[PDB]
Structure formats: C-alpha cells, structure tokens
Amino acid sequence: MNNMNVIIADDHPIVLFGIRKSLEQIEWVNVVGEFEDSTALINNLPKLDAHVLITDLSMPGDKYGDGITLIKYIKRHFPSLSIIVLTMNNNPAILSAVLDLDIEGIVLKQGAPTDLPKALAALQKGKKFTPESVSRLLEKISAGGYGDKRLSPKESEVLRLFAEGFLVTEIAKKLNRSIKTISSQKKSAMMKLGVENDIALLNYLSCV
C-alpha cells in the first residue's frame, strides 16, 4: 500500500534499462519517471511526487551545472528529496567530495549488481548505504590524501621549513645534514606528493 516512489536519471538508456530491471524485482518500489539530461530532470522534479532520486554523477547539464555541482543544485532546491549517486568514477578524491554532500548513499556501476537493491533497502529503513568496494577505496587516501606513500618524518620536516621560507642551504644548516641529502629528501617528497616545481609545491602545502 505504501511504497517508495523513485526517479532515475542517467545519460545512457542501457543503464536506465538495467536499473529498471533491478527495481521491478522489488514490489515496494514504484518508478515515477526517468530522465537522460539534467535540464528535463530539474524541470520535472516539481511536477513529480518522488521520495528518492537515483542519478549519475557525470550527467550533462546545459543549465543547472555538471557533476558534483549538479548534485549540490538538486540538494539545495529539493531538500526533502533523498539522493543515491550512481557512478563509475572510482577516484577516491571524487568519491570523498561526493560524500561531503550528505546524500543518502553511493553505488558504483561496476560494483556488484546487488548493491543498488541494498541501497534502497537501507533507505527504506531511514538508513544510509555505503558498499565495501567504496569503503576500502577510501582507506587508500588514508594518508591525508597524499596517496599510498606517506612522507617520512625527515621528508615532512624539510617541506615544513621550505614552506616557512628557508632555502635548501638554510635547511641543511638548520637540520644538520648535507645539501645533497636535503635536495634528495625534497625531491623524494615532491615525488610522493605529485609536484614538479617549487611554486606548485608551495601552492600545494598552503592548503594542508
């Protein structure tokens, strides 16, 4: 008698198809609309009584934004609406940015076919869902977002002093090691962070 009205939005109709199959094997879900661009979605959301939107992260919007910004748009403008984000982007920084939006869950498209029905079941109990394929990928950028390889204490110290305005020769004195050592530790640290020059490095460090 009381079921979850769902809207589904994706760029590609074979995805829209695949989701519709998964969801008609669930009696308490009613799909009340499907859309292939963000403009038709946004423009029809006021006309449709929906509890939840399942949507692609990377859907093309000519009006209301793209990607993460489009998800912010929707949250802000339809605040009662629960959102599950469906994506194929398994970059940790991207998945993390998404989760800072306080949406009701994330599902990877190449993650298990069972994840989407779990997401909705969690949501049907007022709960948020996060699959393990996502959980473990967020382990990764455990290291403060450096990546897998953390800075060594010595490496961190060198960069700390550079950021404070010391030139390499001054750091060698301050730390009592050779200039060949210091340059090698800086280089090594810059390699771990993904920076190729000092201005990029100093930019990098000023938000960290």
When asked if residue 152 is in the footprint of a second copy (CB under 8 A), the reply is no
Q: In terms of C-beta density within 10 A (0-12 exposed, 13-18 middle, 19 or more buried), how is residue 22 classed? A: middle
Q: Would you say 1 or 207 has its CB closer to a second copy?
A: 207
Question: Given candidates 40, 88, 112, 138, which one binds a second copy under the rule CB under 8 A?
Answer: 88
Question: Given candidates 20, 154, 174, 177, which one binds a second copy under the rule CB under 8 A?
Answer: 174
Is the sign of the CA dihedral 159, 162, 164, 169 positive or negative?
positive
**Which listed range, 26-34, 109-117, 127-135, 186-194, lies at the site for a second copy (CB under 8 A)?**
186-194
Q: What CA–CA distance (Å, rounded) separates 104 from 123?
A: 7
Q: What CA–CA distance (Å, rounded) separates 109 from 116?
A: 9
How near is the Cβ of 28 to a second copy at its closest, in Å? 31
Residues 96-135: x where in contact with a second copy by CB under 8 A, - otherwise, as a string: -xx-------------------------------------
Tell me the C-alpha to C-alpha distance, in Å, between residue 194 and each of 44, 75, 104, 168, 182.
Answer: 43, 33, 33, 19, 18
When asked if residue 79 is in the footprint of a second copy (CB under 8 A), the reply is no
Please, which residues bridge with residue 55 across strands? 9, 85
Residues at the contact surface with a second copy, assessed by CB under 8 A:
57-58, 60, 65-69, 87-89, 91-94, 97-98, 141, 145, 147, 161, 163-167, 170, 173-174, 191, 193-204, 206-208
